[PDB]
Amino acid sequence: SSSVPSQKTYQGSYGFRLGFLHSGTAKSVTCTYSPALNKLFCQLAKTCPVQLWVDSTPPPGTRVRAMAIYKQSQHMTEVVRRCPHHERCSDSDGLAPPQHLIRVEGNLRAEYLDDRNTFRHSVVVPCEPPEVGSDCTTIHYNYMCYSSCMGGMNRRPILTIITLEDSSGNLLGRDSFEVRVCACPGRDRRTEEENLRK
Ligand SMILES: *c1nc(F)c(C#N)cc1F
Ligand SMILES: [Zn+2]
């Protein structure tokens, strides 16, 4: 078992926080975010856009890191990893180790860390300013196991912790959201929001 990174929201000096698109809950949806649950629902290995919002521009060399932890207290010391099936299915893009649950899509500067002390996985990219005509920068994540994968997440809820870091890895900001990776994200978001309203 491993030490548990903080999940405490921390806007920091740059006013760092996440944002999510409004994709709705139709059958064709592959990634959908519930503000009422603070929970992203997505399909396996599909694009998950996450917005990075800041009040002021952080220095060049600022990076942004994603890491998964188990939400429940009896599981939070366990490293989140891909299940024994998906870690062996040879689907690495050449950067992501096959054990890593979270990948970054479409960024050749993504770096993947296996922490030498905690053995936790994370993926980190340079934080870049918004493009022209945009108010935020967007990262595309992929989740490479289902929440239900036996021997992996095994139906246990996870959180993704997003940290803004300086070039040394020191904390500048932190935010987080729950994730369910499932075949029917729109149907599952509708169900869980309906459960919350009852
Ligand atoms: C990461 N890096 C940046 F440079 C900005 C700006 N501006 C935002 C961010 F999330
Ligand atoms: Zn799996």
Q: How crowded is the C-beta side of 12, counted as CA atoms within 13 Å?
A: 21
Nearest Cα to 149, choosing from 77, 91, 101, 98? 101
Cβ atoms of 31 and 43 within 8 Å: the answer is: yes
When computed from its CA atoms, the radius of gyration of the chain, rounded to whole angstroms, is 16
**Closest residue to atom 2 of ligand 1, CA basis:** 127
Ligand nearest, relative to CA of residue 84: 2
Task: Name residues contacting ligand 1 (CB within 6 A).
Answer: 52, 54, 57-58, 62, 64, 127-129, 137
**Closest residue to atom 8 of ligand 1, CA basis:** 129
Cβ atoms of 175 and 160 within 8 Å: the answer is: no
What's the residue count for the chain?
A: 198
Q: State this model's resolution in angstroms.
A: 1.6
Residue 183 to residue 59: CA distance in whole angstroms: 39
Give the DSSP per-residue string, the chain.
Answer: ---------B-TTTT-EEE-----S-TT-SEEEETTTTEEEE-TT--EEEEEE-SSPPPTT-EEEEEEEESSTTTTTSPP---TTGGGS----SSS-TT-SEEESS-TT-EEEE-TTT--EEEEEE--PPPTT-SSEEEEEEE-S-TT-TTTTTT--EEEEEEEE-TT--EEEEEEEEEEE-S-HHHHHHHHHHHHT-
Residue 154 to residue 177: CA distance in whole angstroms: 19
**Ligand 1 pocket: which of 11, 50, 54 to mutate (most atoms within 8 A of CB):** 54
- Extract the tokens encoding 152: 């992996």
User: End-to-end CA distance of the chain, in Å?
Assistant: 37
Report which ligand 1 atom has the smallest distance to the Cα of 64. 1
CA of 147: how far to CAs of 42, 48, 89, 132, 167, in Å? 10, 15, 17, 37, 32
For residue 134, the Cα-to-chain-centroid distance in whole angstroms is: 22
CA of 144: how far to CAs of 58, 65, 165, in Å? 30, 17, 24
Cβ atoms of 154 and 70 within 8 Å: the answer is: no
- Extract the tokens encoding 22: 């409004």
Residue 63 to residue 170: CA distance in whole angstroms: 10
Report which ligand 1 atom has the smallest distance to the Cα of 60. 4
Residue 158 to residue 93: CA distance in whole angstroms: 23
β-partners of residue 53 are 17
Topology of the domain comprising 3-197: Immunoglobulin-like (2.60.40)
For residue 44, the Cα-to-chain-centroid distance in whole angstroms is: 13
